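Ligand: 3-(4-hydroxyphenyl)-1H-indazol-6-ol. Inputs:
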Amino acid sequence: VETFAFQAEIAQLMSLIINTFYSNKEIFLRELISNSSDALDKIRYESLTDPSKLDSGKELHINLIPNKQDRTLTIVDTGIGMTKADLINNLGTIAKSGTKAFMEALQAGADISMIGQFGVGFYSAYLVAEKVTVITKHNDDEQYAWESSAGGSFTVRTDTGEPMGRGTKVILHLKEDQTEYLEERRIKEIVKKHSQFIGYPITLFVE
Ligand SMILES: Oc1ccc(-c2n[nH]c3cc(O)ccc23)cc1
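Predicted complex:
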């Protein structure tokens, strides 16, 4: 298991998300679904010129899996996936410059719901999760598990867990007071409100 420190700017972004009083937490799901849609667009684009890019899975979709026993909400996509280098480099984002722009926007009057406009929407997971685990598999690399409970560090390890073929699985270990995001009616409402124009099938699993 390798343990890394977040860059100071990303640790600052995470503590702002965790510590700021902000009631509109539901936007985390829109942000993660948007990230999954972007990853699916990437593998679809590569497949237009190289059909073998889909040998690791032809179906392009997003699954939402609530688990009340484990208190987890998992977002699975069959997108391009991330390499080990992408995971270490802030989950394939330009998070240092994105955080800079987002901070300036907040100081000027913007609110946390605009996070996605700054390319750091993944971190909105911390509005509802005490810990986030990311399992990913890119065609050019092995399957890895990234994990962080914030606190300034994250871990990366080769995942010997259930093989995914290709794509990313974001496992949200929800905060005790955020279990409404495991309720079918609540998830359905959020997807309908914020993710109505996502161009891939979103399947909400039942328990
Ligand atoms: O370069 C890449 C960057 C990101 C990803 C990616 N795939 N699905 C996700 C879900 C997320 O919540 C966050 C990031 C991703 C894939 C490739």
